[PDB]
Amino acid sequence: IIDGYKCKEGSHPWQVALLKGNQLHCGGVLVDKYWVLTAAHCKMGQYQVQLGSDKIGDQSAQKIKATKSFRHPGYSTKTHVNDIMLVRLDEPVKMSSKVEAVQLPEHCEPPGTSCTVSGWGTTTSPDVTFPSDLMCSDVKLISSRECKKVYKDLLGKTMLCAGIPDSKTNTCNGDSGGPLVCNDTLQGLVSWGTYPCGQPNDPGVYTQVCKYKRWVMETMKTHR
Ligand SMILES: CC1=N[C@H](c2cn(S(=O)(=O)c3ccccc3Cl)c3ccc(C)cc23)CN1
Ligand SMILES: [Cl-]
Ligand SMILES: [Cl-]
Numbered sequence: 774i775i776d777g778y779k780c781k782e783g784s785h786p787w788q789v790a791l792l793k794g795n796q797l798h799c800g801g802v803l804v805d806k807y808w809v810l811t812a813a814h815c816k817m818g819q820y821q822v823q824l825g826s827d828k829i830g831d832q833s834a835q836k837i838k839a840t841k842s843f844r845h846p847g848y849s850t851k852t853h854v855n856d857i858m859l860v861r862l863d864e865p866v867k868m869s870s871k872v873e874a875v876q877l878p879e880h881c882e883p884p885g886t887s888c889t890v891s892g893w894g895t896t897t898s899p900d901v902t903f904p905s906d907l908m909c910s911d912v913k914l915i916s917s918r919e920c921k922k923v924y925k926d927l928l929g930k931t932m933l934c935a936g937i938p939d940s941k942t943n944t945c946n947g948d949s950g951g952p953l954v955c956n957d958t959l960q961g962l963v964s965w966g967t968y969p970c971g972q973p974n975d976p977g978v979y980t981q982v983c984k985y986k987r988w989v990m991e992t993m994k995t996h997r
Pocket of ligand 3: 843
């Protein structure tokens with residue numbers, strides 16, 4: 774997170790870190806005791822999933838292994854559309870003041886809506902500096918039409934842009950797969966942006982979660 778702030782204790786109980794061994798690979802977001810949502814580009818054969826702390830690599834935090842991923846079948850490695858994935862935990866997490874699922878969206882929030890994105894990604898770019906504390910950036914949704922002035926044909930119908938005009942505050946490497954929360958619902962998953970990160974008037978690009986309600990619920994079903 775470029776030009777962010779340390780997230781307030783307890784305000785992000787759904788954030789998880791997806792670790793490759795012990796090292797940060799991506800962010801993700803708890804949606805259920807058994808399920809994490811993240812970007813498709815974050816996929817690995819297995820993960821260690823850190824829950825219930827703002828500190829990355831916290832030795833006191835719960836760590837649950839995960840080895841089953843469920844990408845959206847339309848995910849593209851070329852155009853980056855459908856960059857969304859569910860990951861099933863080996864064991865269920867216990868909920869607490871530090872651990873809680875985010876609320877999945879019922880509707881799509883419109884342009885101009887205030888949001889916050891969180892992650893342990895680098896706070897500088899292109900020289901990287903990885904923080905301990907979970908960082909936050911406050912950003913607003915940008916309409917397609919405005920976002921297309923920057924990204925043109927690269928933007929797909931289910932991508933969602935956010936930033937602040939003339940500000941550097943934004944996502945960066947390691948933030949991938951983390952939550953963009955607006956008006957108390959998950960509206961985005963961190964997907965991509967421009968590199969180097971945190972150039973004013975280069976919006977962050979997210980997967981637009983409200984366009985995948987059916988898929989998320991179907992894929993997670995525990996009954997008929
Ligand atoms: C979908 C996908 N995201 C991955 C990636 C990460 N970066 S990034 O430089 O680290 C980045 C810059 C700005 C904001 C957020 C981020 Cl994560 C990208 C920049 C541009 C593009 C096409 C992809 C990525 C690789 N694949
Ligand atoms: Cl990939
Ligand atoms: Cl998959």
